[PDB]
Amino acid sequence: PIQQLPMMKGMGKDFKNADYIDYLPVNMLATPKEILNSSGYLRSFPGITKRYDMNGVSRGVEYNTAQNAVYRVCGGKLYKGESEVGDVAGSGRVSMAHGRTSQAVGVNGQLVEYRYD
Amino acid sequence: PIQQLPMMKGMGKDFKNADYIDYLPVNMLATPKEILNSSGYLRSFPGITKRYDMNGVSRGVEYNTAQNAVYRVCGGKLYKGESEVGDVAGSGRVSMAHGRTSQAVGVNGQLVEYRYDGTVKTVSNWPADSGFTQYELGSVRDITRLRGRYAWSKDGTDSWFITDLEDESHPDRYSAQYRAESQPDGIIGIGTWRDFIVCFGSSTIEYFSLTGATTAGAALYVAQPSLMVQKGIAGTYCKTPFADSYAFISHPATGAPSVYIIGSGQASPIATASIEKIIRSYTAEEMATGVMETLRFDSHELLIIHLPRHVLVYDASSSQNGPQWCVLKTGLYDDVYRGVDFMYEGNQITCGDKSEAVVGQLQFDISSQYDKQQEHLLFTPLFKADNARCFDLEVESSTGVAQYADRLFLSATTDGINYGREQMIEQNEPFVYDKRVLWKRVGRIRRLIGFKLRVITKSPVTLSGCQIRLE
Amino acid sequence: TTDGINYGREQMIEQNEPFVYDKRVLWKRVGRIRRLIGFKLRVITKSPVTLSGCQIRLE
Amino acid sequence: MQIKTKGDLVRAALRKLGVASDATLTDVEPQSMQDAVDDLEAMMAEWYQDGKGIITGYVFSDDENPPAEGDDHGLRSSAVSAVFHNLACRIAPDYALEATAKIIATAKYGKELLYKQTAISRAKRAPYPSRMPTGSGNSFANLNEWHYFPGE
Amino acid sequence: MQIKTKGDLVRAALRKLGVASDATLTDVEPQSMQDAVDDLEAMMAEWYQDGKGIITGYVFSDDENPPAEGDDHGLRSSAVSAVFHNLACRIAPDYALEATAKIIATAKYGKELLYKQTAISRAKRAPYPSRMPTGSGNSFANLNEWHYFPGE
Amino acid sequence: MQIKTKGDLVRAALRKLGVASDATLTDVEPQSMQDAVDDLEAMMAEWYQDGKGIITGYVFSDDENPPAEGDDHGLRSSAVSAVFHNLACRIAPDYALEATAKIIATAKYGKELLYKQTAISRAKRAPYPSRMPTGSGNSFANLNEWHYFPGE
Amino acid sequence: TANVVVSNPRPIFTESRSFKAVANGKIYIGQIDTDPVNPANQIPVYIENEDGSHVQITQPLIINAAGKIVYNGQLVKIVTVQGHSMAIYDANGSQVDYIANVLKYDPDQYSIEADKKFKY
Amino acid sequence: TANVVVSNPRPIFTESRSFKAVANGKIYIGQIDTDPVNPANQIPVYIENEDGSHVQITQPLIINAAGKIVYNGQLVKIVTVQGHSMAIYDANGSQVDYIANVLKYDPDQYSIEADKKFKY
Amino acid sequence: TANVVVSNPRPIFTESRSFKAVANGKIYIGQIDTDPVNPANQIPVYIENEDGSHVQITQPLIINAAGKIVYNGQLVKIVTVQGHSMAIYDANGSQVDYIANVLKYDPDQYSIEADKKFKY
């Protein structure tokens, strides 16, 4: 008797209240596909390789369609792609938006617009 | 036990990262039809025969219904069918449109119109002597024609201008400029859906409808926010009218690129994981240079995507078990396909060429592109058959129409990446309609097995009902 | 594990090998299930892991 | 004959079983071939019980010459079929297989035919017992005083 | 006869098995032909036990002759059916098939008919023992002092 | 013989069982070695009932040597097949398997062939009873009367 | 000093599963990744004689009983003009082997090669 | 002119003491003037499929009963960089052959320095 | 990502009419376009070690039962300074094969000729 054991999600008991909980796969993504008698596999989440050295921990990101680039607020600087194009104050998460003539950051209760000029 | 093996789409592993991918048939179209214990077969893509000689590589085509003839651009000339009727300057793909009195080509940022009397005009502002409004006419990216008016898009400014009814060589007298304006940027391409002017930008696709106003200066087009799509297009030629709406290739603005079809306010994905991986293998440039088109023959709803290294054909009439994609190629070593700019006229499907100053007519009783033989592949999905010891590989092939007793290379992979010994079996004969293509003794399947089924001919290949005796 | 919380003995099985595309990750002898059983299946690696088709013979 | 090596015998046995041959698209591993050669050597040594079993002319390879496959088996032309049929029957369980009825019957027939000539040669009658007289009709023996058979 | 070579015998065996015949729509496979010829050679060698088995007239190929196929088998007209039926029965398991009852019965009948004449020829009576008198009736022998049979 | 150690015997037994062999892509787990070696040692000790049972020359590993695996088995070339077939049959229930019919038959045949020669050796006839005379034929030259010399 | 290494230049063709030569088999060489038995796909071959006559012969190359190539019963050296696909058939006609792409340059005529390449 | 010879693809390895193919043999390919048995000196070795893609495989290459390279019992085309050393071991672990440099075994040696010291 | 197929560098000498090694064979290396059997036409011959040391040895090279060349009962690589003719004889003294000029050019004289003629 051959039996198939599902792996997309296990079941276990939380011992604090002894309650049935769903054991979620760690770093594993379920990809439905008819491979062989399985109908899906489980793939490791892709690894991260270093690309750039910024000013600090990342605080925001936004794909600027007006400039066809990516704006990242990491640490105390504002980055357009790789280059630094401004300075931002604060230490927490900031809000990002972009328009025709500016990239707007909401931070410290202030709407600071960095224009492309 | 006799087991039937599907051939419309195989399975395999990408040895670069050991991820499971599909194996698409090469130069083969899966035609769904109950033949005999099969329910579907596979037919070689029609071959190409020389029809006309032109000035250079094809750069655009359109069935001008106003003159009821096919207009082509090849090299530096504009052809109405077989006879040159103008001159086009440039080297890249050009945009095309046509109306009652002219054929418009968008090239080098100019809207150049070739009237049917022979006069060549160009779009430009009204002369300053008149009191008509003067606009900031920039470089023209894309063009289209609707309701007797040419609508074109400026180069990356979300601005599109419409011409004047009584003078197509000039914009509208008062109100010619329009903005989508519900997006930071994106005017990548333009078209007409039914009567809506559809502007495909980055991350957005907007529709514009006629207002019906009569006062001078008022806006003639109003945006329809209830019909817009929250997705972009990769390039100016990454879209085409497929079934009843526009099918396109998405832009990196909203995430990973894919192939979508517009529904009603939303985009339904058409590509699978393997197609998405193939698309992602390129860069933002080399997706933005892709070209999409649509072909129809024998109820074959083909959507063809040309990229620098792939040519992917999606069949909408044979997609009852998910998307059905095949790969076209020229030669025997995965070189890119040479046919381009398909268009049906008279009773023939005429196509251009991406590498020569020639035009083909897509013959159907051969599979050779300009007398050069072609390679077709038919991969079988992997399956676990521990100690199966299979026998009697039988494949149904329609034979008879051939110039030589063309053979077939059969091989089996055991790990899904590297194939093994190749055996040549005669798969066709000249004027012989009973052949029974079959290999008697196959080996013992250890853990997995897959079949390759490669064919190299100048004649059409019809295959169905692959079966084994597993025991 | 036999109760869903505490796991048992840990067995080390080669689930990958460089430039080998045919490995058959497999463990012959599993124990006798008294009441319940569950499997943990942990992998520590620098390389991608693709797992599917977990099957077992219950006799 | 076209079967001149132990590996040739193994290949013939595998072809008979249907696992691997010169026409299949998937072949067995050299490790599997070496295991089959080890089986053939073990079975042959079990048969040829140090010269007092099934005599076949089979030559046992030595470890000095490295590869057992590639050595001439030395069997006569009429022993090859029996040898490789029995070998296929013996190595069938390796692949979760079972030799078919024709293979089993042919193996039995071949083994019997192999031992037939040796059995005919070995069907020898023992000499007279040491207590039998030679009889007076043996004139020279009676005269020369060999009145009883020697025996042994 | 129109069956004159090992190739004709192999083709007849394959047709009887249904592997490759004009009754079906299959042609004889070149790689299967060589293996069938090897099996036929082995079966003839096993039958004909170097002269002490079944005498058929089969001619065994040598290493010098390049193609094993193409040589006349040399069988008499009355052994072809038995030879190719037994060949089909033996080479059926190669294709994971099983020969049918009619084929097996015909093979048995053919082998029995093949050995009938040789069995009749070998049904010979042993000479008289050397300890038997010739009897006084044999006047010639008794006068010539042949009082006992020579024997041996 | 290529099989020269208890490890080789165990590997051959597992390959017959279809548990750990290249033909199945499976490798031997390290803990399937020691258990099978213990089973083999127990079987051989049971057979060799302190010298009054089956004699094979098998070498019994001792306590001083740490690794039981990898020691030479010491069996003759005509015992290896029987030993490893019996080992596979014995260790099949460990994996909740069942040794197939061919393996069981080969095990029986091998054990019988193993004890055949020792049975021939032990088929000895007892000396003459304690109340026989030698007869005047023997006692006429030396007055032996009541003694049969234990020659052979 | 070391200038020339003595080696056997005569190729040997053997079977794919056994260490025995292809007794009187046939070789077809044609365009790469194709069916060499097709005369349209075949490419020219030349016997390179001891002097370099470079004489063109018919396509099906007959193998000796020793696994070597013969023509009129004489051992010959055979060269072609480009990379090729090679299909080797046994004596019976069964397919022994098929390789889609193989290209081993002639290690000979280096004097001519140097005269062609190097400027004076 | 014709400059590519029709040699034997899928080369054959043989025992050093008898005319027998090395069955179940092991091949290690390594750097120049080193022992390829040590994985540190082991260089990549790929297989060339019919589609042309080169797939690297594990280093100890298996030689079957025919003396040729097999991957999964199937003959494959094995490719590597120009400069490498070869170590051939038998099935019993004995040292069969050791070549410190393949390029030092061409039938000529003038070609190397004649190309390297002249001007093009 | 590779540019050469692995091959067996060592030369194997087999008979021309049959597939067996030239056991106890004789190799005679002599001047170009002459009989290497006669000692007058004979030329000096060296063995090249693994590291590169050259040792001049006697001319008639003994080919062991495996078809390979051994000097001290050990496989070696044999070199000559100049281009040569090669005669391979079997153990019975019969003529197995003859190459009148191995390289169809003499490297010894071509070295000075190229030095004096070609540019640097």
CSV table of N, CA and C in Angstrom, one decimal, chain B residues 373-437:
chain,number,residue,atom,x,y,z
B,373,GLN,N,15.6,22.5,-45.6
B,373,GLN,CA,14.9,21.6,-44.7
B,373,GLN,C,14.8,22.2,-43.3
B,374,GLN,N,13.8,21.6,-42.6
B,374,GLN,CA,13.5,22.1,-41.3
B,374,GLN,C,13.4,20.9,-40.3
B,375,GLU,N,13.5,21.3,-39.0
B,375,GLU,CA,13.6,20.4,-37.9
B,375,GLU,C,12.4,20.6,-37.0
B,376,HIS,N,11.7,19.5,-36.7
B,376,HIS,CA,10.5,19.5,-35.8
B,376,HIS,C,10.8,18.6,-34.6
B,377,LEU,N,10.4,19.0,-33.4
B,377,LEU,CA,10.7,18.2,-32.2
B,377,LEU,C,9.4,17.9,-31.5
B,378,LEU,N,9.3,16.7,-30.9
B,378,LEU,CA,8.0,16.4,-30.2
B,378,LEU,C,8.4,15.7,-28.9
B,379,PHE,N,8.5,16.5,-27.8
B,379,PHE,CA,8.9,15.9,-26.5
B,379,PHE,C,7.7,15.4,-25.8
B,380,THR,N,8.0,14.3,-25.1
B,380,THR,CA,7.0,13.6,-24.3
B,380,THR,C,7.3,13.9,-22.8
B,381,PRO,N,6.2,14.1,-22.0
B,381,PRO,CA,6.4,14.4,-20.6
B,381,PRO,C,7.1,13.3,-19.8
B,382,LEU,N,7.9,13.6,-18.8
B,382,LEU,CA,8.5,12.6,-17.9
B,382,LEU,C,7.4,11.9,-17.1
B,383,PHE,N,7.7,10.6,-16.8
B,383,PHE,CA,6.8,9.9,-15.9
B,383,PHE,C,7.6,8.8,-15.2
B,384,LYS,N,7.2,8.5,-14.0
B,384,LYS,CA,7.9,7.5,-13.1
B,384,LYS,C,7.4,6.1,-13.5
B,385,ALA,N,8.2,5.3,-14.0
B,385,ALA,CA,7.9,3.9,-14.5
B,385,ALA,C,8.9,2.9,-14.0
B,386,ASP,N,9.2,2.9,-12.7
B,386,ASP,CA,10.2,2.0,-12.1
B,386,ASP,C,10.0,0.6,-12.6
B,387,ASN,N,11.0,0.1,-13.2
B,387,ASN,CA,11.1,-1.3,-13.7
B,387,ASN,C,9.9,-1.7,-14.6
B,388,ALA,N,9.6,-0.7,-15.5
B,388,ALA,CA,8.4,-0.9,-16.4
B,388,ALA,C,8.8,-1.8,-17.5
B,389,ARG,N,9.9,-1.6,-18.2
B,389,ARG,CA,10.4,-2.5,-19.3
B,389,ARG,C,9.4,-2.4,-20.4
B,390,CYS,N,9.3,-1.2,-21.0
B,390,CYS,CA,8.4,-0.8,-22.0
B,390,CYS,C,8.8,-1.3,-23.4
B,391,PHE,N,7.8,-1.5,-24.3
B,391,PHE,CA,8.0,-2.1,-25.6
B,391,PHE,C,7.0,-1.3,-26.6
B,392,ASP,N,7.3,-1.5,-27.9
B,392,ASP,CA,6.4,-1.2,-29.0
B,392,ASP,C,6.0,0.3,-29.0
B,393,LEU,N,6.9,1.2,-29.2
B,393,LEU,CA,6.6,2.6,-29.5
B,393,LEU,C,6.0,2.7,-30.8
B,394,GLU,N,4.7,3.0,-30.9
B,394,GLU,CA,4.0,3.2,-32.1
B,394,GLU,C,3.5,4.6,-32.2
B,395,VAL,N,3.7,5.2,-33.4
B,395,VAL,CA,3.3,6.6,-33.6
B,395,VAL,C,2.5,6.6,-35.0
B,396,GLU,N,1.4,7.2,-35.0
B,396,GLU,CA,0.6,7.3,-36.2
B,396,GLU,C,1.0,8.5,-37.0
B,397,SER,N,1.4,8.3,-38.2
B,397,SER,CA,1.9,9.4,-39.1
B,397,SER,C,1.2,9.3,-40.4
B,398,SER,N,0.7,10.4,-40.9
B,398,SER,CA,0.1,10.5,-42.2
B,398,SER,C,1.2,10.6,-43.3
B,399,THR,N,1.4,9.7,-44.1
B,399,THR,CA,2.5,9.6,-45.1
B,399,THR,C,1.9,9.7,-46.5
B,400,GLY,N,2.9,9.8,-47.5
B,400,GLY,CA,2.5,9.8,-48.9
B,400,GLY,C,3.0,11.1,-49.6
B,401,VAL,N,2.9,12.2,-49.0
B,401,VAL,CA,3.3,13.5,-49.7
B,401,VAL,C,4.8,13.8,-49.2
B,402,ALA,N,5.7,13.3,-50.0
B,402,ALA,CA,7.1,13.5,-49.6
B,402,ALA,C,8.0,13.3,-50.9
B,403,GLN,N,9.1,14.0,-50.9
B,403,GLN,CA,10.1,13.8,-52.0
B,403,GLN,C,11.2,12.8,-51.7
B,404,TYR,N,11.3,12.4,-50.4
B,404,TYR,CA,12.3,11.4,-50.0
B,404,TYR,C,11.7,10.6,-48.8
B,405,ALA,N,12.2,9.4,-48.6
B,405,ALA,CA,11.8,8.6,-47.5
B,405,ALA,C,12.4,9.1,-46.2
B,406,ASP,N,12.0,10.3,-45.8
B,406,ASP,CA,12.6,11.0,-44.6
B,406,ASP,C,12.4,10.1,-43.4
B,407,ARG,N,13.5,10.2,-42.5
B,407,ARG,CA,13.5,9.4,-41.3
B,407,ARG,C,13.3,10.3,-40.1
B,408,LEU,N,13.4,9.6,-38.9
B,408,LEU,CA,13.0,10.2,-37.7
B,408,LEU,C,14.0,9.7,-36.6
B,409,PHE,N,14.5,10.7,-35.8
B,409,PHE,CA,15.5,10.3,-34.8
B,409,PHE,C,14.7,10.2,-33.5
B,410,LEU,N,14.7,9.0,-32.9
B,410,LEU,CA,14.1,8.7,-31.6
B,410,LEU,C,15.1,8.5,-30.5
B,411,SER,N,14.9,9.2,-29.4
B,411,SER,CA,15.8,9.0,-28.3
B,411,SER,C,15.1,9.2,-27.0
B,412,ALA,N,15.6,8.7,-25.9
B,412,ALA,CA,15.0,8.7,-24.6
B,412,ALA,C,16.0,9.2,-23.6
B,413,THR,N,15.5,10.2,-22.8
B,413,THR,CA,16.2,10.7,-21.6
B,413,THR,C,15.8,10.0,-20.4
B,414,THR,N,16.8,9.8,-19.5
B,414,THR,CA,16.5,9.1,-18.2
B,414,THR,C,16.6,10.1,-17.0
B,415,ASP,N,17.1,11.3,-17.2
B,415,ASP,CA,17.2,12.3,-16.1
B,415,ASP,C,16.5,13.6,-16.5
B,416,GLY,N,15.9,13.7,-17.7
B,416,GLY,CA,15.1,14.8,-18.1
B,416,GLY,C,15.9,16.0,-18.6
B,417,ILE,N,17.2,15.8,-18.7
B,417,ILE,CA,18.1,16.9,-19.3
B,417,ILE,C,18.9,16.4,-20.5
B,418,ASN,N,19.6,15.3,-20.3
B,418,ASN,CA,20.5,14.7,-21.3
B,418,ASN,C,19.8,13.5,-22.0
B,419,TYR,N,19.7,13.5,-23.3
B,419,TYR,CA,19.2,12.4,-24.0
B,419,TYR,C,20.2,11.4,-24.4
B,420,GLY,N,19.8,10.2,-24.9
B,420,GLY,CA,20.7,9.2,-25.1
B,420,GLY,C,20.9,8.8,-26.6
B,421,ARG,N,20.9,7.5,-26.9
B,421,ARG,CA,21.1,7.0,-28.2
B,421,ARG,C,20.0,7.4,-29.1
B,422,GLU,N,20.3,7.7,-30.3
B,422,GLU,CA,19.3,8.2,-31.3
B,422,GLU,C,19.2,7.1,-32.4
B,423,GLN,N,17.9,6.7,-32.7
B,423,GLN,CA,17.7,5.6,-33.7
B,423,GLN,C,16.9,6.3,-34.8
B,424,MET,N,17.2,5.9,-36.0
B,424,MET,CA,16.6,6.5,-37.2
B,424,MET,C,15.5,5.5,-37.7
B,425,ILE,N,14.3,5.9,-37.8
B,425,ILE,CA,13.2,5.1,-38.3
B,425,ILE,C,12.5,5.8,-39.4
B,426,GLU,N,12.2,5.2,-40.5
B,426,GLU,CA,11.6,5.8,-41.6
B,426,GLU,C,10.2,6.2,-41.2
B,427,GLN,N,9.9,7.5,-41.2
B,427,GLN,CA,8.6,8.1,-40.8
B,427,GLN,C,7.7,8.5,-42.0
B,428,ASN,N,8.3,8.5,-43.2
B,428,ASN,CA,7.5,8.9,-44.4
B,428,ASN,C,8.1,8.2,-45.6
B,429,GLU,N,7.2,8.1,-46.6
B,429,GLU,CA,7.7,7.5,-47.9
B,429,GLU,C,7.0,8.2,-49.0
B,430,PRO,N,7.6,8.3,-50.2
B,430,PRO,CA,6.9,9.0,-51.3
B,430,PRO,C,5.8,8.2,-51.9
B,431,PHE,N,4.6,8.7,-51.8
B,431,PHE,CA,3.4,8.1,-52.4
B,431,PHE,C,3.1,6.7,-51.8
B,432,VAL,N,3.3,6.6,-50.5
B,432,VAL,CA,3.0,5.4,-49.7
B,432,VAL,C,2.2,5.9,-48.5
B,433,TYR,N,1.0,5.5,-48.4
B,433,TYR,CA,0.0,6.0,-47.4
B,433,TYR,C,-0.2,5.0,-46.2
B,434,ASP,N,0.6,3.9,-46.2
B,434,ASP,CA,0.5,2.9,-45.1
B,434,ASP,C,1.9,2.7,-44.6
B,435,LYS,N,2.3,3.1,-43.4
B,435,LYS,CA,3.7,3.0,-43.0
B,435,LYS,C,3.9,2.3,-41.6
B,436,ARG,N,3.0,2.7,-40.7
B,436,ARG,CA,3.1,2.1,-39.3
B,436,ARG,C,4.5,2.4,-38.7
B,437,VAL,N,4.7,3.6,-38.4
B,437,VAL,CA,6.0,4.0,-37.8
B,437,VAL,C,6.0,3.5,-36.4
